[PDB]
Amino acid sequence: SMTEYKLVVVGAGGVGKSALTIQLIQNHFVDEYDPTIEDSYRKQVVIDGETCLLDILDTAGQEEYSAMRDQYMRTGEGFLCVFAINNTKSFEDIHHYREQIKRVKDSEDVPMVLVGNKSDLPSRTVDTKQAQDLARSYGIPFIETSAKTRQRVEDAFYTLVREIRQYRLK
Numbered sequence: 242s243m244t245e246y247k248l249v250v251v252g253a254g255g256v257g258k259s260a261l262t263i264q265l266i267q268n269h270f271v272d273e274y275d276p277t278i279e280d281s282y283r284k285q286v287v288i289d290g291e292t293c294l295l296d297i298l299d300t301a302g303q304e305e306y307s308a309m310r311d312q313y314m315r316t317g318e319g320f321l322c323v324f325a326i327n328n329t330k331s332f333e334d335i336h337h338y339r340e341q342i343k344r345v346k347d348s349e350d351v352p353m354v355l356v357g358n359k360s361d362l363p364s365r366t367v368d369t370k371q372a373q374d375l376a377r378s379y380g381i382p383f384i385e386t387s388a389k390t391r392q393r394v395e396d397a398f399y400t401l402v403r404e405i406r407q408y409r410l411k
């Protein structure tokens with residue numbers, strides 16, 4: 242009695258993809274994690290009374306031309322789209338990840354959660370209002386997280402599970 246979910250964490254270099262994933266799985270904050278390391282992690286959790294097996298891919302390279310990137314966008318079921326709230330360029334990158342995923346899936350129906358990470362940092366450059374409006378225009382949830390303090394990390398991944406589960410009934 243268990244259901245599987247394939248999750249993929251994308252976003253620009255340095256936004257905190259690795260830090261978020263490692264906090265969820267190992268309960269510690271990594272400060273200098275080699276930015277080229279790309280690994281998958283499995284974790285079993287209970288969400289809404291369902292025992293779920295999460296298979297999570299922490300992506301390293303974000304290159305436009307990559308056969309392996311095309312393969313994991315084909316294989317993945319939901320996408321954690323991450324920007325850092327102190328890096329406006331990373332928030333502007335989001336549009337390109339969403340367009341890439343839609344292309345590969347040939348679909349509008351794509352499970353996605355927008356994540357504004359580094360919420361612990363006081364010098365914000367991306368207004369929460371702007372990030373909510375972008376999420377609204379995509380029809381997806383929006384969550385701010387801190388991989389440093391562990392704020393809303395479980396929340397972000399479990400919200401993406403709930404999105405996949407709902408899309409399966411449509």
Ligand SMILES: Nc1nc2c(ncn2[C@@H]2O[C@H](COP(=O)(O)OP(=O)(O)O)[C@@H](O)[C@H]2O)c(=O)[nH]1
Binds near residue numbers: 253254360390
């Ligand atoms: N203050 C703060 N720093 C973070 C947070 N998440 C990641 N970092 C730092 O930002 C840098 C890049 O994080 P990393 O997870 O390796 O980014 P990736 O390239 O997206 O995997 C590292 O020095 C992390 O410790 C956060 O929530 N708060």
Ligand SMILES: O=S(=O)(Nc1nc2cccc(Cl)c2s1)c1cccc(O)c1
Binds near residue numbers: 248298
């Ligand atoms: O051989 S893989 O298809 N393994 C994968 N493992 C996982 C785990 C969770 C979600 C997804 Cl999309 C994947 S894809 C692959 C493909 C491309 C890059 C990789 O690091 C791994």
Ligand SMILES: [Mg+2]
Binds near residue numbers: 274276
């Ligand atoms: Mg990384």
